[PDB]
Design a protein around this ligand. Structure first.
Ligand code: CLA
Ligand code: CLA
Ligand code: CLA
Ligand code: CLA
Ligand code: CLA
Ligand code: CLA
Ligand code: CLA
Ligand SMILES: CCCCCCCCCCCCCCCCCC(=O)OC[C@H](COP(=O)(O)O)OC(=O)CCCCCCCCCCCCCCCCC
Ligand SMILES: CC1=C[C@H](O)CC(C)(C)[C@H]1/C=C/C(C)=C/C=C/C(C)=C/C=C/C=C(C)/C=C/C=C(C)/C=C/C1=C(C)C[C@H](O)CC1(C)C
Ligand SMILES: CC1=C[C@H](O)CC(C)(C)[C@H]1/C=C/C(C)=C/C=C/C(C)=C/C=C/C=C(C)/C=C/C=C(C)/C=C/C1=C(C)C[C@H](O)CC1(C)C
Ligand SMILES: CC1=C[C@H](O)CC(C)(C)[C@H]1/C=C/C(C)=C/C=C/C(C)=C/C=C/C=C(C)/C=C/C=C(C)/C=C/C1=C(C)C[C@H](O)CC1(C)C
Lengths: 231, 219, 207, 221, 41
């Protein structure tokens, strides 16, 4: 019928006639069966989409302008202009402020659209999770299909970031470097080529990121997610 | 009856209604089933809590002041021997007898107040001072000459709040003095020394390392 | 509600508008009892005023220490203020402080237990009385217009100064030097010099 | 009616093990939960045993997988001595008493829920700790606790057939994990190696590596 | 198991189990604390 995550199948119960953008009748485990839980999961999905979009775009642009640096270790070897403890504290304070405001918007919409400084500036009434106003200056057409575009690009970017970190853990190099490693040898650079388990032998690709990395005196156990369960 | 209890889920015993200060419904041994015995135990709780508050104060404030270089007071457990070696020290038996005689005079009056709450207030008892022993109708809360500042005698519920504060502080100090006795019996150091040692290594310095609590025969 | 958006005022802070700085901040509900809230409001005024006096003293004396105006009296740290000889020894200074503060604070408590009962001196002179912790000690008269706004400014400065003195003692027990020197040492980088890089505050770092 | 633990056979215990409880297949040959109060107590015990064994078996499996991967992770049967050797500043009595006290707090919460199903959703705890009932027809307390804290994703609020399916999942996985821990203990006793070690030893060599070849089960071969 | 527990609550079963647990407690006390002639604290 309509657009579905599995053509020919039907929507569940909680997803019948979705108001959320990018609804394709998924949720096999029924995580969104509850009402307010579905709204909380929608907000978490939207911020996950946007954060992963930012992350994938940042990794790609950092590699285009600087191919010699490795994004997985970029947090330890980048030469910060400022000290890291004060930087982390500044981020914690300001992001605590903004995320508390966003979360309390999700708890109740008409509660904090107002500038705490200036009484004249205030966001207009909006659907939860879509602030707009100052946050949305320029809109290319109607809002609904562009929201669908945003959410679909966000799903793609979350999958992209997971692929990025797995390429970094398996190959030890950049995901565009991993791309150019896969194109010249398509039959051999696949994970099926380098990782086969059979009842009698298990072949696991070696981990490239060092288990312990030293950073300003201390050591961080940034190993390789977890081994053992690797195919 | 809906007050917080010592076990959210276990209803209070029928002899603990809620009127007494600090009634959290805690009586698993049912020691206070008799009402007159309950009143005697309430007075005993008040006396033990007040004496423990005085004793724990006189232990932990001089020990802290000694820790920060004020007055320099010896350990509470050995403070009896420190004075007993003085050049003008009162002998132990004589001092104990003087203390016991004064306390006999005072607390036989307190005992007779426990029986009948308006006992000592009758005219002609003292030399004009019997007016100060009227009582407030509840034994263990005399008032009069006691409570000079008149704290709580304004709104009745103000006194009940102070009564609950008194009973909780008394129970805390009784537990604290039991802790002081058991800590010095096991470890030959002060309460603040034990506290400082515990903050050095809580997983190593505790009651499972003194060698006296858990017997060495079992382990 | 004022102290926290998307939060509700704790009932007993709603109907009483006549409180200075009533922003609804009482999450632990210390003053649900009205007499307890009256006591805590008096404690507010007392702690805030003594903290404003104390923090102003610390900042002014440390400014005079860092720049240099007074002699050997002002050229000492605030925590080392007892090293000077002054005019009287420790014991008599503490004693007369006990006596005259007993006099003044017992006058204040006598006002507290009965407002307006203690405004008259044995000389016969009398003063006006208003509210409870506001005994009308206003000679040059700035109370005749919008007294609520002036009280709000006073209570905001009082809370700021109580926070200031808590900061003063915490910094002094954490880092050496004068609080103005600590502010300058913070302003040096400032990305490294802060409360995390002390070795005495976070404990998780540097053992 | 329902699928029984022994197909056919209608001497299944009288109508206290009717097809109402989750996981009910009429299996009570010894009558250890014949009386209704003992039946409710044993339902609580079974759910708790299933959840605890599921957590324990998952931990054992993950630590055994990590041990074969070369990580600095001991096997489950020797993790206590390994922890004490790696951390000599911890007293054994210290950690044991701390475990007793913290476990006792939540276990007395659960106990006073067992005594009174509605008494734990008030006081210091919020209304989410009231419970949702289920067994024996009650709608409060019991082994199943709803709320946004013990069901933060809310997978049994809404769609009752989803709740029934998930409860059947939980009880079947719990019984399977209890038998799994029994197998772990027996394999450690009879072989001296870990569970994953035994599994990959049997997968590498299907034959000559069964339970009869360890010398403990069959005590002469 | 009501009748079985009632049988376990019967006087001979309860007295045998009680003397068993008391004797075992005393035996393990003498196992860990042997030759206690006096109550020396
Ligand atoms: C953590 C990120 C996240 C979150 C919070 C959501 C949340 C939501 N998604 Mg979504 N989704 C995501 C990521 C996420 N998604 C990604 C990356 C993809 C691409 C594969 C999709 C593709 C997708 C489709 C096609 C649809 C949804 C839909 C929905 C909504 C209903 C489903 C539901 O109620 O369950 C809530 C889901 C969660 C609470 C996430 C739980 C995460 C578990 C606990 C971790 C397990 C990870 C899993 C094993 C995968 C490993 C990650 C990686 C290796 C791939 C809901 C609000 C449906 C909808 O109606 O749209 C509005 C729908 O049609 N999603
Ligand atoms: C009922 C509680 C209680 C008890 C039983 C004691 C008992 C004791 N205290 Mg203590 N004390 C207490 C409360 C108590 N205190 C409290 C609440 C404080 C304030 C926090 C103190 C502060 C304190 C200090 C600073 C010292 C003691 C000392 C002593 C010891 C000797 C006292 C003495 O010389 O004879 C009795 C004292 C008298 C003044 C007798 C009264 C008769 C005089 C002549 C009339 C007054 C004029 C003694 C074992 C001293 C010590 O440690 O010995 C080395 C000591 O240094 N106490
Ligand atoms: C209410 C705040 C306050 C207080 C309590 C003091 C207290 C004191 N000041 Mg000071 N002072 C203050 C504010 C204050 N000052 C301010 C705001 C300034 C800047 C204008 C000064 C500038 C100042 C100077 C320049 C000197 C003092 C000195 C003194 C001390 C002795 C004064 C004397 O005997 O005459 C004068 C003493 C002479 C030797 C001359 C004394 C303890 C004197 C001092 O430090 O003693 C060595 C000193 O010379 N003060
Ligand atoms: C670093 C340790 C230390 C401490 C703890 C104190 C403490 C005190 N000093 Mg002192 N002083 C110190 C070092 C210290 N001083 C040094 C190093 C010097 C110079 C060498 C001086 C010189 C000095 C002088 C000259 C004077 C004091 C005075 C006082 C008292 C203030 C009066 C008062 O509180 O009103 C009265 C108190 C009450 C009515 C109630 C008793 C207090 C209770 C506990 C309530 C108070 C709450 C409490 C403060 C809050 C909790 C602690 C908080 C910090 C977290 C006070 C108890 C003054 C004094 O003796 O009193 C007039 C005084 O004149 N000090
Ligand atoms: C200690 C864990 C435990 C507990 C408390 C229960 C409790 C219960 N089960 Mg359950 N069960 C368990 C484990 C457990 N089960 C496991 C591991 C399996 C998979 C083999 C099953 C499979 C199962 C089925 C198919 C059914 C039940 C059913 C029931 C209910 C009725 C039976 C009864 O009243 O007897 C009470 C049970 C006990 C008192 C525990 C028995 C322990 C004995 C005394 C020790 C000996 C057994 C041990 C394995 C021998 C080796 C020990 C040692 C040598 C190693 C009851 C609430 C029936 C039901 O209606 O579900 C609600 C039913 O249909 N159980
Ligand atoms: C209740 C779950 C549980 C279980 C099943 C086990 C099981 C085991 N523990 Mg263990 N332990 C536990 C809880 C548990 N422990 C707790 C809560 C602590 C405190 C944090 C410890 C601390 C501990 C230490 C220090 C050691 C063990 C050791 C052992 C192993 C051998 C012990 C032995 O030989 O005697 C038989 C044990 C039993 C029959 C368990 C039955 C008793 C419980 C209550 C059930 C064994 C497989 C030893 C080891 O590492 O092996 C080499 C070791 O020395 N444990
Ligand atoms: C009424 C007569 C009597 C008395 C007073 C004693 C007294 C004593 N016997 Mg003895 N005994 C007796 C009769 C008596 N016995 C008889 C008739 C026999 C023949 C069966 C024995 C055979 C016997 C043996 C073989 C031994 C003793 C030992 C002891 C001593 C151990 C104390 C102890 O157990 O630690 C303290 C016990 C506790 C603190 C537990 C008290 C609390 C419990 C749990 C309450 C129990 C509730 C009921 C003790 C002084 C032991 C010893 O070494 O002698 C020095 C020992 O080896 N007795
Ligand atoms: C250990 C035995 C204790 C079992 C608990 C008490 C049994 C109660 C019961 O089963 O109900 C009676 C039950 C009748 O139901 P009723 O209406 O409760 O009497 O009898 C049965 O159907 C099963 C009896 C089996 C008893 C097993 C005896 C031990 C077997 C060991 C084999 C070796
Ligand atoms: C739907 C559902 C429902 C049903 O029922 C169930 C299930 C199935 C479970 C589900 C789900 C699924 C899934 C897939 C999920 C996933 C998610 C994700 C992936 C997220 C991420 C997400 C992700 C994310 C955020 C990410 C982010 C990232 C970032 C920011 C980055 C950053 C960075 C950069 C720039 C660079 C530098 O130099 C560094 C760094 C710092 C590194
Ligand atoms: C409630 C109940 C009921 C249910 O039914 C049952 C049961 C469980 C039995 C229960 C419980 C109970 C309990 C807990 C008890 C405890 C008590 C105590 C501890 C007391 C103390 C009490 C305590 C006390 C008095 C104390 C006091 C003290 C003092 C004076 C001290 C003194 C001193 C000092 C200063 C110092 C010096 O140098 C020395 C001396 C001379 C030594
Ligand atoms: C509201 C609430 C309610 C809820 O519900 C809960 C909670 C949260 C608990 C809360 C909060 C609270 C708080 C925060 C408190 C704080 C306070 C303070 C800080 C005070 C101070 C306070 C402070 C103060 C008085 C201070 C004062 C000071 C002073 C005098 C100083 C003096 C001085 C000077 C000048 C100089 C010289 O050379 C030295 C000296 C001698 C040193």
């Amino acid at each position: 019928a309509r657009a579905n995550w599995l053509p020919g199948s039907d929507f569940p119960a909680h997803l019948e006639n979705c108001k959320l953008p990018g609804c394709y009748g998924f949720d096999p485990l029924g995580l969104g069966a509850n009402e307010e839980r579905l709204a909380w999961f929608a907000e978490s999905e939207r911020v996950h989409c946007r954060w992963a979009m930012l992350g994938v775009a940042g990794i790609l642009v950092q590699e285009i302008v600087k191919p010699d640096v490795f994004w997985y270790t970029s947090g330890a070897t980048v030469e910060l202009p400022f000290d890291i403890t004060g930087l982390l504290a500044f981020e914690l304070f300001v992001m605590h402020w903004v995320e508390s405001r966003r979360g309390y918007d999700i708890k109740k919409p008409g509660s904090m659209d107002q500038d705490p400084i200036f009484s004249n500036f205030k966001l207009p009434a909006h659907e939860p999770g879509y602030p707009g106003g100052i946050f949305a200056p320029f809109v290319p057409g109607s809002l609904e299909e562009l929201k669908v575009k945003e959410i679909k690009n966000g799903r793609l970017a979350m999958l992209a970031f997971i692929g990025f970190t797995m390429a970094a853990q398996v190959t030890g190099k950049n995901p565009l470097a991993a791309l150019r490693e896969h194109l010249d040898n398509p039959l051999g650079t696949t994970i099926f080529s380098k990782a086969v388990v059979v009842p009698g032998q298990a072949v696991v690709p070696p981990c490239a990121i060092p288990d312990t990395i030293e950073f300003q005196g201390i050591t961080i156990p940034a190993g390789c997610f977890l081994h053992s369960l690797w195919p | 009856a809906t007050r917080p209890l010592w076990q959210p889920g276990v209803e209070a015993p029928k002899h603990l209604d809620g009127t007494m200060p600090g009634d959290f419904g805690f009586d698993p041994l049912n020691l206070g089933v008799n009402k007159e015995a309950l009143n005697w135990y309430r007075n005993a709780e008040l006396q033990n809590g007040r004496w423990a508050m005085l004793g724990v104060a006189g232990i932990v404030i001089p020990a802290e002041l000694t820790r920060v270089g004020v007055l320099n007071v010896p350990e509470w457990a050995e403070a009896g021997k420190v004075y007993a070696e003085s050049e003008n020290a009162i002998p132990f038996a004589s001092l104990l007898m003087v203390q016991l005689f004064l306390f006999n005079f005072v607390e036989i009056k307190r005992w007779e107040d426990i029986k009948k709450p308006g006992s000592q207030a009758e005219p002609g008892s003292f030399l004009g001072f019997e007016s100060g022993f009227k009582g407030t109708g509840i034994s263990g809360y005399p008032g009069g000459a006691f409570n000079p500042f008149g704290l709580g005698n304004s709104s009745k519920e103000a006194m009940d709040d102070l009564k609950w504060r008194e009973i909780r502080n008394g129970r805390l100090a009784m537990v604290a003095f039991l802790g002081f006795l058991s800590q010095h019996a096991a470890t030959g150091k002060g309460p603040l020394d034990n506290l400082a040692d515990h903050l050095a290594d809580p997983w190593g310095a505790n009651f499972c390392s003194n060698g006296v609590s858990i017997p060495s025969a079992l382990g | 509600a004022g102290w926290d958006l998307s939060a509700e005022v704790p009932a007993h802070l709603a109907g009483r508008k006549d409180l200075a700085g009533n922003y609804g901040f009482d999450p632990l509900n210390l003053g649900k009892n009205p007499e307890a809230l009256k006591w805590y409001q008096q404690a507010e005024l007392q702690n805030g005023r003594w903290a404003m006096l104390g923090v102003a003293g610390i900042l002014v004396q440390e400014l005079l220490h860092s720049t240099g105006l007074g002699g050997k009296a002002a050229d000492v740290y605030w925590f080392d203020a007892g090293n000077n000889t002054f005019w009287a020894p420790k014991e008599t200074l503490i004693a007369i402080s006990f006596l005259m503060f007993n006099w003044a604070e017992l006058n204040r408590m006598q006002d507290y237990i009965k407002p307006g009962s203690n405004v008259t001196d044995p000389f016969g002179n009398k003063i006006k009385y208003v509210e409870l912790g506001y005994p009308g000690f206003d000679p040059l008269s700035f109370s005749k217009n919008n007294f609520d706004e002036w009280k709000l400014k006073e209570i905001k400065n009082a809370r700021l100064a109580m926070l200031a003195f808590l900061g003063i003692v915490a910094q002094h027990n954490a880092q050496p030097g004068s609080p103005l020197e600590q502010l300058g040492a913070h302003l040096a980088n400032p990305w490294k010099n802060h409360f995390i890089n002390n070795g005495v505050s976070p404990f998780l770092t540097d053992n | 009616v329902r699928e029984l633990w022994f197909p056919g056979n209608k001497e299944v215990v009288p109508d206290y093990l009717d097809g109402s409880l989750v996981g009910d297949h009429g299996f009570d040959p010894l009558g250890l939960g014949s009386s209704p109060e003992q039946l409710s107590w044993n339902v609580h015990a079974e759910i708790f045993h299933g959840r605890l064994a599921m957590t324990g078996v998952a931990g054992i499996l993950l630590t055994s997988l990590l041990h074969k991967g070369g990580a600095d992770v001991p096997e489950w049967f020797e993790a206590g001595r390994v922890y004490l050797d790696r951390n000599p500043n911890v007293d054994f009595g210290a950690l044991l008493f701390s475990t007793i006290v913290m476990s006792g707090f939540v276990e007395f919460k659960r106990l006073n829920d067992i005594r009174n199903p509605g008494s734990q959703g008030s006081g210091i705890l919020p209304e989410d700790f009231k419970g949702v009932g289920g067994p024996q027809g009650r709608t409060v307390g019991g082994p199943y606790v709803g709320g946004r804290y013990f069901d933060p994703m809310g997978l049994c609020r809404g769609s009752p057939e989803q709740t029934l399916k998930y409860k059947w999942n939980e009880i079947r996985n719990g019984r399977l994990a209890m038998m799994a821990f029994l197998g772990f203990a027996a394999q450690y006793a009879a072989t001296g190696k870990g569970p994953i070690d035994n599994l990959v030893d049997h997968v590498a060599d299907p034959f000559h590596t069964t339970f009869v070849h360890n010398g403990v089960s069959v005590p002469f071969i | 198991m009501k009748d079985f527990t009632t049988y376990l609550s019967t006087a001979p079963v309860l007295t045998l189990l009680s003397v068993t647990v008391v004797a075992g407690l005393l035996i393990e006390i003498n196992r860990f604390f042997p030759d206690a002639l006096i109550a020396a604290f």
